[PDB]
Amino acid sequence: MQLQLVESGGGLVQAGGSLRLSCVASGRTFRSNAMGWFRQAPGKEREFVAAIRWSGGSTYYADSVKGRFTISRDNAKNTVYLQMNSLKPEDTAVYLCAAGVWRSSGWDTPDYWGQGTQVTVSSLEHHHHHH
């Protein structure tokens, strides 16, 4: 059972608004003891935002986003939440989730990564889309 991370919630928010990501793992499947959340950009590799493991606390965030950015694991339906409150206009990038198992050395190994959900934080602006 390989971790296939299906991410959703990707859209445009304004700078100071809240955006929640949800990553459903293979519909409803488990094999990930070590998970994460990373940001990716054109030319820039995935940078550590957060990490969630099997119990122990499972919580990480940057100083510049202290407390506003929060994470949760809901393994009952196998969905991982990234609740980012008050996003900066420079969070216009493609976020992805991480998955994998723990190393016996005590090191954290992201074996899998997400499909890449594009989050676009506009500077206090929005976009209309007619059908």
Side-chain angles (χ1 to χ4, degrees):
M1 298 299 180
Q2 299 185 89
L3 283 306
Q4 309 181 92
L5 299 176
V6 182
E7 303 182 90
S8 53
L12 189 147
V13 295
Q14 71 294 333
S18 56
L19 183 55
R20 184 188 61 201
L21 287 304
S22 49
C23 182
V24 188
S26 307
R28 181 167 52 241
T29 309
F30 65 109
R31 198 185 184 236
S32 188
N33 299 332
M35 304 187 308
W37 287 98
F38 291 79
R39 68 180 65 223
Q40 228 277 27
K44 306 283 76 169
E45 300 179 89
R46 69 288 178 168
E47 178 57 73
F48 186 81
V49 180
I52 302 175
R53 283 189 164 205
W54 175 74
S55 189
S58 303
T59 45
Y60 292 87
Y61 49 89
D63 185 271
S64 303
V65 301
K66 176 182 280 61
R68 313 190 319 245
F69 289 28
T70 306
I71 55 286
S72 181
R73 177 184 185 139
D74 290 66
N75 196 87
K77 59 278 192 178
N78 299 92
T79 306
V80 189
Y81 297 88
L82 175 65
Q83 182 55 87
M84 298 190 291
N85 288 38
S86 187
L87 298 82
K88 311 307 300 173
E90 57 187 83
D91 291 271
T92 300
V94 51
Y95 272 61
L96 50 78
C97 186
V101 294
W102 59 273
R103 183 66 180 200
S104 303
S105 180
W107 183 263
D108 187 82
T109 50
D111 191 85
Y112 293 96
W113 290 279
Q115 304 303 89
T117 179
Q118 289 273 209
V119 302
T120 304
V121 188
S122 190
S123 302
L124 290 307
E125 289 295 281
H126 299 93
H127 282 259
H128 290 105
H129 292 109
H130 298 273
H131 295 101

Coordinates of all heavy atoms in Angstrom, one line a residue, residues 34-83:
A34 N 5.7 8.7 9.4 CA 6.3 10.0 9.3 C 5.8 10.8 8.1 O 5.8 10.3 7.0 CB 7.8 9.8 9.2
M35 N 5.2 12.0 8.4 CA 4.6 12.8 7.4 C 5.1 14.3 7.5 O 5.7 14.6 8.6 CB 3.0 12.8 7.5 CG 2.4 11.4 7.4 SD 0.5 11.5 7.4 CE 0.2 12.5 8.8
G36 N 4.8 15.1 6.5 CA 5.2 16.5 6.5 C 4.4 17.4 5.7 O 3.4 16.9 5.1
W37 N 4.7 18.7 5.7 CA 4.1 19.7 4.8 C 5.3 20.6 4.3 O 6.1 21.0 5.1 CB 3.0 20.6 5.4 CG 1.7 19.8 5.6 CD1 1.3 19.2 6.8 CD2 0.7 19.6 4.6 NE1 0.0 18.7 6.5 CE2 -0.3 18.9 5.2 CE3 0.6 20.0 3.3 CZ2 -1.5 18.6 4.5 CZ3 -0.6 19.7 2.6 CH2 -1.6 18.9 3.2
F38 N 5.4 20.8 3.0 CA 6.5 21.5 2.4 C 6.0 22.5 1.3 O 4.9 22.2 0.8 CB 7.5 20.5 1.7 CG 8.3 19.6 2.7 CD1 7.7 18.4 3.3 CD2 9.7 19.8 2.9 CE1 8.5 17.6 4.1 CE2 10.4 19.0 3.8 CZ 9.8 17.9 4.4
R39 N 6.7 23.5 1.0 CA 6.4 24.5 0.0 C 7.4 24.3 -1.2 O 8.6 24.1 -1.0 CB 6.5 26.0 0.5 CG 7.9 26.5 0.9 CD 7.9 27.9 1.4 NE 7.2 28.0 2.7 CZ 6.3 29.0 3.0 NH1 6.1 30.0 2.2 NH2 5.7 29.0 4.2
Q40 N 6.9 24.5 -2.4 CA 7.7 24.3 -3.6 C 7.4 25.4 -4.6 O 6.3 26.0 -4.6 CB 7.3 22.9 -4.3 CG 8.5 22.0 -4.7 CD 9.2 22.3 -6.0 OE1 9.1 23.4 -6.5 NE2 9.8 21.3 -6.6
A41 N 8.4 25.9 -5.3 CA 8.3 27.1 -6.2 C 9.1 26.8 -7.5 O 10.1 26.0 -7.4 CB 8.8 28.3 -5.4
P42 N 8.8 27.5 -8.6 CA 9.6 27.3 -9.9 C 11.1 27.7 -9.7 O 11.4 28.9 -9.5 CB 8.9 28.3 -10.9 CG 8.1 29.2 -10.0 CD 7.7 28.4 -8.8
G43 N 12.0 26.7 -9.6 CA 13.4 26.8 -9.4 C 13.8 26.5 -8.0 O 15.0 26.3 -7.7
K44 N 12.9 26.5 -7.0 CA 13.1 26.3 -5.6 C 12.5 24.9 -5.2 O 11.4 24.6 -5.5 CB 12.5 27.4 -4.8 CG 12.9 28.9 -5.2 CD 14.3 29.3 -4.7 CE 15.5 28.7 -5.5 NZ 16.8 29.4 -5.2
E45 N 13.3 24.1 -4.4 CA 13.0 22.8 -3.9 C 12.0 23.0 -2.7 O 11.7 24.1 -2.2 CB 14.2 22.0 -3.5 CG 15.2 21.8 -4.6 CD 16.5 21.0 -4.2 OE1 16.5 19.8 -4.2 OE2 17.5 21.7 -3.8
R46 N 11.4 21.8 -2.3 CA 10.5 21.8 -1.2 C 11.1 22.1 0.2 O 12.0 21.5 0.6 CB 9.7 20.4 -1.1 CG 10.6 19.1 -0.7 CD 11.6 18.7 -1.8 NE 12.4 17.5 -1.3 CZ 13.2 16.8 -2.1 NH1 13.2 17.0 -3.4 NH2 13.9 15.8 -1.6
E47 N 10.6 23.2 0.8 CA 11.1 23.7 2.1 C 10.2 23.3 3.3 O 8.9 23.4 3.1 CB 11.2 25.3 2.0 CG 11.7 26.0 3.3 CD 13.1 25.4 3.9 OE1 14.1 25.8 3.2 OE2 13.1 24.7 4.9
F48 N 10.8 22.9 4.4 CA 10.1 22.4 5.5 C 9.1 23.4 6.2 O 9.6 24.5 6.7 CB 11.1 21.9 6.5 CG 10.6 21.1 7.8 CD1 10.2 19.8 7.7 CD2 10.4 21.8 9.0 CE1 9.7 19.2 8.8 CE2 9.9 21.1 10.1 CZ 9.5 19.8 10.0
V49 N 7.8 23.2 6.2 CA 6.8 24.0 6.8 C 6.4 23.4 8.1 O 6.3 24.0 9.2 CB 5.6 24.3 5.9 CG1 4.5 25.1 6.5 CG2 6.0 24.9 4.5
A50 N 6.0 22.0 8.1 CA 5.5 21.3 9.2 C 5.8 19.8 9.1 O 6.3 19.3 8.0 CB 4.0 21.5 9.2
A51 N 5.6 19.0 10.2 CA 5.7 17.6 10.2 C 4.8 16.9 11.3 O 4.7 17.4 12.4 CB 7.2 17.1 10.4
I52 N 4.2 15.8 10.9 CA 3.2 15.0 11.7 C 3.7 13.6 11.7 O 3.8 13.0 10.7 CB 1.8 15.1 11.2 CG1 1.2 16.6 11.1 CG2 0.8 14.2 12.0 CD1 -0.1 16.7 10.5
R53 N 3.9 13.0 12.9 CA 4.2 11.6 13.1 C 3.1 10.9 13.8 O 2.1 11.5 14.2 CB 5.6 11.4 13.8 CG 6.8 11.6 12.9 CD 8.1 11.3 13.6 NE 9.2 11.1 12.6 CZ 10.3 10.4 12.8 NH1 10.5 9.7 13.9 NH2 11.2 10.3 11.8
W54 N 3.3 9.5 14.0 CA 2.4 8.7 14.9 C 2.6 9.1 16.3 O 3.6 8.7 17.0 CB 2.7 7.2 14.6 CG 2.0 6.3 15.5 CD1 0.6 5.9 15.5 CD2 2.5 5.6 16.7 NE1 0.3 5.1 16.5 CE2 1.4 4.8 17.2 CE3 3.7 5.5 17.3 CZ2 1.5 4.1 18.4 CZ3 3.9 4.7 18.4 CH2 2.8 4.0 19.0
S55 N 1.7 10.0 16.8 CA 1.7 10.5 18.2 C 3.0 11.3 18.6 O 3.8 11.6 17.7 CB 1.4 9.4 19.2 OG 1.1 9.8 20.5
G56 N 3.1 11.7 19.8 CA 4.3 12.4 20.3 C 4.2 13.9 20.4 O 4.9 14.6 21.1
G57 N 3.2 14.5 19.6 CA 3.0 15.9 19.5 C 2.5 16.3 18.1 O 1.4 16.8 17.9
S58 N 3.5 16.1 17.1 CA 3.2 16.1 15.7 C 2.8 17.6 15.2 O 1.6 17.8 14.8 CB 2.1 15.1 15.3 OG 2.6 13.8 15.6
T59 N 3.8 18.5 15.3 CA 3.5 20.0 15.2 C 4.9 20.7 14.9 O 5.8 20.5 15.7 CB 2.9 20.6 16.5 OG1 3.7 20.1 17.7 CG2 1.4 20.3 16.7
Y60 N 4.9 21.4 13.8 CA 6.0 22.3 13.4 C 5.5 23.5 12.6 O 4.5 23.4 11.9 CB 7.1 21.5 12.5 CG 7.9 20.4 13.2 CD1 7.4 19.1 13.3 CD2 9.1 20.6 13.8 CE1 8.1 18.1 13.9 CE2 9.9 19.6 14.4 CZ 9.3 18.3 14.4 OH 10.0 17.3 15.0
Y61 N 6.2 24.6 12.7 CA 5.8 25.9 12.0 C 7.0 26.9 12.1 O 7.9 26.7 13.0 CB 4.5 26.6 12.6 CG 4.5 26.7 14.1 CD1 5.0 27.8 14.7 CD2 3.9 25.7 14.9 CE1 5.0 28.0 16.1 CE2 3.9 25.8 16.3 CZ 4.4 27.0 16.9 OH 4.4 27.1 18.2
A62 N 7.1 27.8 11.1 CA 8.1 28.9 11.1 C 7.8 30.0 12.1 O 6.6 30.2 12.5 CB 8.2 29.4 9.6
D63 N 8.8 30.7 12.5 CA 8.7 31.9 13.4 C 7.8 33.0 12.9 O 7.0 33.6 13.6 CB 10.1 32.4 13.8 CG 10.1 33.5 14.9 OD1 9.9 34.7 14.6 OD2 10.2 33.2 16.1
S64 N 7.9 33.2 11.6 CA 7.1 34.3 10.9 C 5.6 34.0 10.7 O 4.8 34.8 10.4 CB 7.8 34.4 9.5 OG 9.1 34.7 9.6
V65 N 5.3 32.7 11.0 CA 3.9 32.2 10.9 C 3.4 31.5 12.2 O 2.4 30.8 12.2 CB 3.7 31.2 9.6 CG1 4.1 31.9 8.3 CG2 4.5 29.9 9.8
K66 N 4.2 31.8 13.3 CA 4.0 31.2 14.6 C 2.5 31.2 15.1 O 1.9 32.3 15.3 CB 4.9 32.0 15.6 CG 4.7 31.5 17.1 CD 5.6 32.3 18.1 CE 7.1 31.9 18.2 NZ 7.8 32.1 16.9
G67 N 2.0 30.0 15.2 CA 0.7 29.8 15.8 C -0.5 29.9 14.8 O -1.5 29.2 15.0
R68 N -0.3 30.7 13.8 CA -1.3 30.9 12.8 C -1.5 29.7 11.9 O -2.6 29.2 11.6 CB -1.0 32.1 11.9 CG -0.5 33.4 12.6 CD -0.4 34.6 11.6 NE 0.2 34.3 10.3 CZ 1.3 34.7 9.8 NH1 2.1 35.5 10.6 NH2 1.7 34.4 8.6
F69 N -0.3 29.1 11.5 CA -0.2 27.9 10.7 C -0.2 26.7 11.7 O 0.6 26.6 12.6 CB 1.1 27.9 9.8 CG 1.1 28.9 8.6 CD1 0.3 30.0 8.6 CD2 1.8 28.6 7.5 CE1 0.3 30.9 7.5 CE2 1.9 29.4 6.4 CZ 1.1 30.6 6.4
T70 N -1.2 25.8 11.5 CA -1.5 24.7 12.4 C -1.7 23.4 11.5 O -2.2 23.6 10.4 CB -2.8 25.0 13.2 OG1 -2.6 26.2 13.9 CG2 -3.1 23.9 14.2
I71 N -1.4 22.2 12.0 CA -1.5 21.0 11.3 C -2.2 19.9 12.2 O -2.1 19.9 13.4 CB -0.1 20.4 10.8 CG1 1.0 20.3 11.9 CG2 0.4 21.3 9.6 CD1 1.6 21.6 12.4
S72 N -2.9 18.9 11.5 CA -3.6 17.8 12.2 C -3.6 16.6 11.3 O -3.7 16.7 10.1 CB -5.0 18.3 12.5 OG -5.8 17.3 13.2
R73 N -3.6 15.4 11.9 CA -3.8 14.1 11.2 C -5.1 13.5 11.7 O -5.3 13.3 12.9 CB -2.6 13.1 11.6 CG -2.7 11.7 11.0 CD -1.6 10.8 11.4 NE -1.7 9.5 10.7 CZ -0.6 8.8 10.3 NH1 0.6 9.3 10.4 NH2 -0.8 7.6 9.7
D74 N -5.9 13.2 10.7 CA -7.2 12.6 10.9 C -7.2 11.2 10.2 O -7.6 11.1 9.0 CB -8.4 13.5 10.4 CG -8.6 14.7 11.3 OD1 -7.7 15.6 11.3 OD2 -9.7 14.8 11.9
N75 N -6.7 10.2 10.9 CA -6.4 8.9 10.3 C -7.6 8.0 10.2 O -7.6 7.0 9.5 CB -5.3 8.2 11.1 CG -4.6 7.0 10.4 OD1 -3.6 7.2 9.6 ND2 -5.1 5.8 10.6
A76 N -8.7 8.5 10.8 CA -10.1 7.8 10.8 C -10.6 7.8 9.3 O -11.3 6.8 9.0 CB -11.0 8.6 11.7
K77 N -10.3 8.8 8.5 CA -10.6 8.8 7.1 C -9.4 8.9 6.2 O -9.4 9.0 5.0 CB -11.7 9.9 6.7 CG -11.3 11.4 7.0 CD -11.5 11.8 8.5 CE -11.4 13.3 8.8 NZ -11.7 13.6 10.2
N78 N -8.2 9.0 6.9 CA -6.9 9.2 6.3 C -6.8 10.5 5.5 O -6.8 10.4 4.2 CB -6.4 7.9 5.5 CG -6.3 6.7 6.4 OD1 -7.3 5.9 6.5 ND2 -5.2 6.4 7.0
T79 N -6.9 11.6 6.2 CA -6.8 12.9 5.6 C -5.9 13.8 6.5 O -6.1 13.9 7.7 CB -8.2 13.5 5.3 OG1 -9.0 12.6 4.6 CG2 -8.1 14.9 4.6
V80 N -4.9 14.5 5.9 CA -4.0 15.3 6.6 C -4.3 16.8 6.3 O -4.4 17.2 5.2 CB -2.5 15.0 6.2 CG1 -1.5 15.7 7.1 CG2 -2.3 13.5 6.2
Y81 N -4.5 17.6 7.4 CA -4.9 19.0 7.3 C -3.8 20.0 7.5 O -3.0 19.8 8.5 CB -6.1 19.3 8.2 CG -7.4 18.5 7.9 CD1 -7.6 17.2 8.4 CD2 -8.3 19.0 7.0 CE1 -8.7 16.5 8.1 CE2 -9.5 18.2 6.7 CZ -9.6 17.0 7.2 OH -10.7 16.2 6.9
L82 N -3.6 21.0 6.6 CA -2.7 22.1 6.8 C -3.6 23.4 6.9 O -4.0 23.9 5.9 CB -1.7 22.2 5.6 CG -0.8 23.4 5.6 CD1 0.2 23.4 6.7 CD2 0.0 23.5 4.2
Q83 N -3.9 23.8 8.1 CA -4.7 25.0 8.4 C -3.7 26.2 8.5 O -3.2 26.5 9.6 CB -5.6 24.9 9.6 CG -6.5 26.1 9.9 CD -7.4 26.5 8.8 OE1 -8.5 25.9 8.6 NE2 -6.9 27.4 7.9

